[PDB]
Amino acid sequence: NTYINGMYFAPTQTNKEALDYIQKYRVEATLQYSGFKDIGTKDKEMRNYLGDPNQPKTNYVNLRSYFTGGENIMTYKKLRIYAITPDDRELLV
């Protein structure tokens, strides 16, 4: 078993300013029991990329802070973005 903890999303390229425009993320994942359920939204945070203290700060999905009791597997899940007024869509598997 491998379980997924979080997402150090998009380490700092030469040009990513549009990530500063984003405030909310929304995720649907598969639980260990009754997979592919809808989970609500949270707000992104700042963390150093790959945990190294000599690194710029990036956006992080803290997947543990949601309406889950179980864990996550290497199978199907979806990840939608909220820009401030609309909804977008970014990530899948």
Partner: protein, 49 residues
């Protein structure tokens, strides 16, 4: 105030005699670095003539 070709003024204290820089707790710090920005208003201004 000030003139146009000069930098703006700043406030960073809140006492009667200037000390004690303004505090912000943990939840407000997290929501501040979440990308949301603070807003500012004017209530009443006194002066002299």
């Amino acid at each position: 105030y000030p003139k146009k070709g000069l930098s703006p003024l700043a406030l960073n204290t809140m006492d009667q005699f200037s000390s004690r820089l303004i505090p912000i707790n943990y939840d407000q710090l997290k929501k501040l670095d979440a990308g949301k920005q603070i807003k500012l208003e004017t209530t009443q201004v006194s002066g002299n003539f």
